[PDB]
Write a protein that holds these residues in place. Structure first.
Motif, PDB file in Angstrom:
ATOM      1  N   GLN A   1       0.739  -1.296   0.072  1.00 19.83           N
ATOM      2  CA  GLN A   1       0.002   0.021   0.156  1.00 19.83           C
ATOM      3  C   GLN A   1       0.702   1.315   0.040  1.00 19.83           C
ATOM      4  OE1 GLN A   1      -1.121  -0.519   4.778  1.00 19.83           O
ATOM      5  NE2 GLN A   1      -1.936   1.208   3.598  1.00 19.83           N
ATOM      6  N   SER A   2       0.097   2.346  -0.456  1.00 18.81           N
ATOM      7  CA  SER A   2       0.877   3.605  -0.449  1.00 18.81           C
ATOM      8  C   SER A   2      -0.086   4.555  -0.295  1.00 18.81           C
ATOM      9  CB  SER A   2       1.701   3.799  -1.661  1.00 18.81           C
ATOM     10  OG  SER A   2       0.861   3.733  -2.962  1.00 18.81           O
ATOM     11  N   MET A   3       0.525   5.975   0.365  1.00 19.76           N
ATOM     12  CA  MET A   3      -0.599   7.041   0.726  1.00 19.76           C
ATOM     13  C   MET A   3       0.308   8.199   0.810  1.00 19.76           C
ATOM     14  SD  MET A   3      -1.419   6.467   4.715  1.00 19.76           S
ATOM     15  CE  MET A   3      -2.349   4.976   4.238  1.00 19.76           C
ATOM     16  N   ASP A   4      -0.448   9.174   0.573  1.00 18.27           N
ATOM     17  CA  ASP A   4       0.316  10.675   0.522  1.00 18.27           C
ATOM     18  C   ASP A   4      -0.532  11.365   1.823  1.00 18.27           C
ATOM     19  OD1 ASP A   4       0.056  10.596  -2.582  1.00 18.27           O
ATOM     20  OD2 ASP A   4       2.024  10.875  -1.854  1.00 18.27           O
ATOM     21  N   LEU A   5       0.214  11.898   2.930  1.00 19.44           N
ATOM     22  CA  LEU A   5      -0.423  12.254   3.993  1.00 19.44           C
ATOM     23  C   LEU A   5      -0.030  13.821   4.127  1.00 19.44           C
ATOM     24  CD1 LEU A   5       1.374   9.884   6.283  1.00 19.44           C
ATOM     25  CD2 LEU A   5      -1.280   9.976   5.951  1.00 19.44           C
ATOM     26  N   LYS A   6      -0.962  14.543   4.809  1.00 20.87           N
ATOM     27  CA  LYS A   6      -0.845  15.872   4.937  1.00 20.87           C
ATOM     28  C   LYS A   6      -1.160  16.706   6.417  1.00 20.87           C
ATOM     29  N   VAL A   7      -0.354  17.551   6.932  1.00 16.89           N
ATOM     30  CA  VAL A   7      -0.645  17.916   8.021  1.00 16.89           C
ATOM     31  C   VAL A   7      -1.762  19.193   8.001  1.00 16.89           C
ATOM     32  CG1 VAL A   7       0.413  19.161  10.302  1.00 16.89           C
ATOM     33  CG2 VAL A   7       1.493  17.299   9.111  1.00 16.89           C
ATOM     34  N   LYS A   8      -2.705  19.060   8.850  1.00 16.31           N
ATOM     35  CA  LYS A   8      -3.783  20.127   8.571  1.00 16.31           C
ATOM     36  C   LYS A   8      -3.740  20.922   9.514  1.00 16.31           C
ATOM     37  CE  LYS A   8      -5.659  18.602   4.594  1.00 16.31           C
ATOM     38  NZ  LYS A   8      -5.606  19.423   3.377  1.00 16.31           N
ATOM     39  N   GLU A   9      -3.730  20.413  10.904  1.00 18.04           N
ATOM     40  CA  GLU A   9      -3.775  21.190  12.014  1.00 18.04           C
ATOM     41  C   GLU A   9      -2.400  20.931  12.828  1.00 18.04           C
ATOM     42  OE1 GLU A   9      -7.519  20.472  13.802  1.00 18.04           O
ATOM     43  OE2 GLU A   9      -8.297  20.193  11.587  1.00 18.04           O
ATOM     44  N   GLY A  10      -1.840  21.823  13.488  1.00 22.42           N
ATOM     45  CA  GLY A  10      -0.779  21.565  14.591  1.00 22.42           C
ATOM     46  C   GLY A  10       0.513  21.509  13.756  1.00 22.42           C
ATOM     47  N   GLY A  11       0.551  21.842  12.716  1.00 22.52           N
ATOM     48  CA  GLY A  11       2.015  22.125  12.183  1.00 22.52           C
ATOM     49  C   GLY A  11       2.746  23.382  12.585  1.00 22.52           C
ATOM     50  N   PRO A  12       3.917  23.124  12.453  1.00 20.56           N
ATOM     51  CA  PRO A  12       4.826  22.167  12.077  1.00 20.56           C
ATOM     52  C   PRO A  12       4.886  21.215  13.308  1.00 20.56           C
ATOM     53  CG  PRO A  12       6.279  23.932  12.616  1.00 20.56           C
ATOM     54  CD  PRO A  12       4.990  24.424  12.562  1.00 20.56           C
ATOM     55  N   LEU A  13       4.815  19.948  12.994  1.00 21.42           N
ATOM     56  CA  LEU A  13       4.850  18.905  13.867  1.00 21.42           C
ATOM     57  C   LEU A  13       6.241  18.786  14.782  1.00 21.42           C
ATOM     58  CD1 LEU A  13       3.035  15.739  12.200  1.00 21.42           C
ATOM     59  CD2 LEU A  13       2.158  17.525  13.904  1.00 21.42           C
TER      60      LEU A  13
END
Lengths: 223, 216, 215, 218
Positions: free
Chosen positions: B37-49
């Motif tokens: 499997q593969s996926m692209d993730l994005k930070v929406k809140e709380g960034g930068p982690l």
């Protein structure tokens, strides 16, 4: 050659479980380069053993593991001087066993000096009420820390009426001389008691171990 | 008819680490029968982690595991109703992460509802200091207890100076509907952050898993 | 900054085994007498399917009787306040993570609480609601790497007389730099005085006094 | 009697290296105080921190009020035994057992001690420990025997603490009445020792209680 394809084993274990001392001696032989070994164990003191024999079997030698040359063999390097290891076995119901093994080499026979101490096994638990069947096959995890080799694996004993009884293994392997340290790798194990009488005074024990480097493109794409 | 050789994933994770909330959404795809499997993730809140992203990757579905005919496939059998899992990740320096995932299926797309909560990570530890590189390959161990499937495995993160940082995983798998239970077996896992931007606001994550029955 | 009579306002949002819930509370206490009480109401996720006792310790060290003998980390942290994170590892594998961000507005401490528990077995005392009360306990406090730590093995008594243990690991973080205390203890006694059948309403009391061990 | 005698022999190993220690002591069981002098006969000089053995070197030396049932004083003259696992935070683990008998007014201990996985760079092997902080052990009944649970801590030289989790099982040799959930405060101190800890004078003080009470002190 330091390690021959057919080698012998001689050991004596002295220890206690819940404060009750016992002693066991064994003689065996195995194939270090094939990762197989077998031995016959005899209870010398403390018999008949009032606890599950399975808690001792993994204590009754890393040199008996088939290592590919891709992965450094820390243990076969440690000879002829040998090596030692200490182990803590934390069972999920509070029973805990500490074990040590000092391994030396005499000709073509490996010599173990083993100490085993288990405590806090409840009277109604599967160990005291001898309810274990066998160890499930396991994958040990080996890694370097403080310049020595460590072993981590959560094991599981199959129980009489079904279900599993887990145990956390933490092992430290120390070669007596300076050897080359391996990378993070694994060793699959399978330990089996092939035969025994009622009180486990006589036990025939088998072990089979193979090192590997985890989920690989695999090599089985023909030739 | 329920699981195709190509399925999709859509997810949203909401959580916090050491009390600081964040949210992440992802889209991806995989091949359930090939265990990849593969996926692209994005930070929406709380960034930068402010913590190591690696502590989240294993939370970002065992249906993407290559199961032989040798072993009952609890997860593929659990659909179309789906299943959920709860997991505790006990790191050796005291940090603890609790995670849940509610997995549903809408057509060919898996939908994850993820909650993630980690606490007691020391400021000088490898997680808060972002000193991790990649999860080492692992063998997840699966067994039945009280009618549900469980997963126990001691994982390890390799660190920048070459060291290793261990973590004890305890997962509980629960099928929405009554499903036949498998025997004691294993699942080898390999998870990697293949690509990412500087702040890990974008992460491309791949995983590969194959079930087996241990030393035969 | 800290008055002899203070009030409490809180909201807890969380989940147990994936099932979300929300609780709000208002209370009162005496920081220097180490006593407090509050009334809690379930706002979401009711009726709660788990033992309420696993939440009571999450529902403020400032409500602890500290002698002159011992540095008071918590009362010093105000008016800026402090926060804490806690893991609660129960002996049967259930584990709860909790956070509390404590601020002060006038007389009232304001808590922002998150609570997440997983891996509680269906047949265990928590999911079966067979817990009676937390036994009184002695929490150990110590400094590590410039932070104040909270360590203690607790135990819940069960309906049939048994005990169910839990290991608490707490980290206390002041919002501003304060002076760190030396190794000491805090005795606890927490009690649910009253509740309705399904614990939609709960009246909770706590009593705490710090000391420095066997003299 | 208010004054009792102690004789013990400890045999054990740490990280595979055997050692043996003998001790003679005395204490006041009803006052919760005791003292002893310990001597290393084998395995000296000890290559590990002595502090890991002191708590192994008898809950009969604990002041119990009539408030709380005394499991330990009940168990005599037959005596009792205990097993203990001490899980240190860096992976070191010590297992210990003690078989306690009574011959006249003198308690006799048969002690076994086995510790493993102590790192070479850790405070136990580098001998950087100072003393045990006072603590409060919590005792409770499980499966008809008394259990002891407490997380303890050792202070290090350069500041800080090294934690250890104690799990003890106490087993009376005869049938005695079981106590309720209660506590015992403990303070252990090495009052004197020579350079290599081959001789150690050790003191212990213990008092049972029931937790935060209408407190009696008035």
């Amino acid at each position: 050659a330091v390690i021959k394809p057919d080698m012998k084993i001689k050991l004596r274990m002295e220890g206690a479980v819940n404060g009750h001392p016992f002693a066991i001696e064994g003689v065996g032989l195995g194939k270090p380069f094939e990762g197989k070994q077998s031995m016959d164990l005899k209870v010398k003191e403390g018999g008949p053993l009032p606890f599950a024999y399975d808690i001792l079997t993994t204590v009754f030698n890393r040199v008996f593991a088939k290592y590919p040359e891709n992965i450094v063999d820390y243990f076969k390097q440690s000879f002829p001087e040998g090596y030692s290891w200490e182990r803590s076995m934390n069972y999920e119901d509070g029973g805990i066993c500490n074990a040590t093994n000092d391994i030396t080499l005499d000709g073509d026979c490996y010599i173990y000096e083993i100490r085993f101490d288990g405590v806090n096994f409840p009277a109604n638990g599967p160990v005291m009420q001898k309810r274990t069947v066998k160890w499930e096959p396991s994958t040990e995890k080996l890694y370097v820390r403080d310049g020595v080799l460590k072993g981590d694996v959560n094991q599981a004993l199959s129980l009489e009426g079904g279900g599993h009884y887990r145990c956390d293994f933490k092992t430290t392997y120390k070669a007596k001389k300076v050897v080359q340290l391996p990378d993070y790798h694994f060793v699959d194990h399978h330990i089996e008691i092939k035969s025994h009488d009622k009180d486990y005074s006589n036990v025939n024990l088998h072990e089979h171990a193979e090192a590997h480097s985890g989920l690989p493109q695999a090599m089985d794409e023909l030739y």
